[PDB]
């Protein structure tokens with residue numbers, strides 16, 4: 001989920 | 012008796028001494044000293060000097076950085092545009108009227124300044140709700156074989172405009188109304204008079220449920236599911252140090268976004284729920300201006316939390332501000 005967290009700007 | 016009524020206003024000050032005047036015609040120096048109006052003008056000047064450049068730079072760096080023009084960032088630009096409506100559609104007007112001592116634009120300007128100030132505040136509110144829905148759909152993935160594309164992000168922005176228009180327009184057509192509030196320098200929704208001609212009771216209830224309870228449940232659910240998904244994904248992958256770091260960072264941001272949302276709208280919800288319940292009481296114009304302190308300041312700290320704390324925006328902003336090389 002690390003790639004989805006970067007897309008949403010959370011990580 | 013604690014107030015003075017009028018055709019299109021309600022001054023929270025009894026007229027037993029004959030000094031109360033219309034907030035559209037004469038200064039209101041009997042409900043607050045002139046320096047208190049200057050302090051009101053001083054705080055509005057603070058929100059303009061801090062709210063405009065931070066929100067304008069957000070729209071400016073998106074034009075200069077191609078990697079910022081992603082569909083998941085459409086709702087963040089909608090938040091910046093909403094804060095700009097709060098600045099020029101309300102903050103600048105309140106700075107001007109406070110220096111006069113009263114609302115000098117009359118009932119027509121009261122509906123204009125009230126429509127735009129309510130619109131900008133509601134677009135920003137529903138933008139934080141849509142942002143939580145988008146992050147819940149993308150991360151938690153509750154929809155089998157779903158890709159969040161550009162067409163979904165446009166609907167998310169249009170959904171905020173519809174919910175805001177379904178909230179700021181009824182006061183212009185007969186459901187509740189816009190009147191000067193507190194120190195009679197800014198206009199907003201009426202919740203201090205039971206004005207039966209416009210059904211203020213059914214509107215405050217509709218506003219408390221649809222535009223506060225529903226957004227609060229959606230944000231807690233979407234972000235609650237997001238913290239649960241991230242914490243359980245890191246539990247099944249404890250060999251990755253970056254996954255453990257991301258789990259703590261994501262959890263810390265959810266706490267900040269949830270607490271900041273409460274600090275923004277819960278004081279406006281509790282005080283307006285007390286003003287509308289224990290109606291007609293000796294409400295001080297200073298007492299009126301403490302939910303507005305937290306809600307109006309969201310034009311400053313929402314970009315700090317949702318833009319400046321974003322790694323992509325912060326890098327592009329430092330580059331733009333430092334002449335293009337950093």
Ligand SMILES: *[C@@H]1O[C@H](CO)[C@@H](O[C@@H]2O[C@H](CO)[C@@H](O[C@@H]3O[C@H](CO)[C@@H](O)[C@H](O[C@@H]4O[C@H](CO)[C@@H](O)[C@H](O)[C@@H]4O)[C@@H]3O)[C@H](O)[C@H]2NC(C)=O)[C@H](O)[C@H]1NC(C)=O
Nearest residue numbers: 015016017018020022025026027028029030031032033034
């Ligand atoms: C808070 O309470 C204040 C005190 O009662 C009140 O102010 C008064 O408002 C009335 C008007 O409703 C004022 O009455 C006028 O006074 C002027 C000057 O004395 C008179 O000339 C005028 O008479 C007119 O005469 C015309 C002659 O041709 C006639 O055609 C007109 O029809 C009319 O009769 C009125 O007598 C009164 O002076 C005000 N007093 C003070 C101390 O300001 C505030 O409006 C009230 N506040 C709110 C927000 O309602």
Ligand SMILES: CCCCCCCCO[C@@H]1O[C@H](CO)[C@@H](O)[C@H](O)[C@H]1O
Nearest residue numbers: 037038106107108109110111112113
């Ligand atoms: C940034 C621009 C702010 C404009 C400040 C408006 C000042 C209001 O000036 C008004 O003039 C009247 C007639 O002289 C007087 O009653 C008062 O001084 C004042 O109410």
Ligand SMILES: *C(=O)CCCCCCCCCCCCCCC
Nearest residue numbers: 060061330331332333334335336
């Ligand atoms: C290219 O080299 C850009 C130069 C960056 C210099 C940074 C200067 C910081 C200025 C801060 C402005 C504060 C204004 C306070 C107003 C009350």
Ligand SMILES: CC(C)=CCC/C(C)=C/CO
Nearest residue numbers: 218219222223279280283
């Ligand atoms: C409708 C009013 C004056 C208070 C209701 C609570 C609240 C903060 C709604 C935000 O849209």
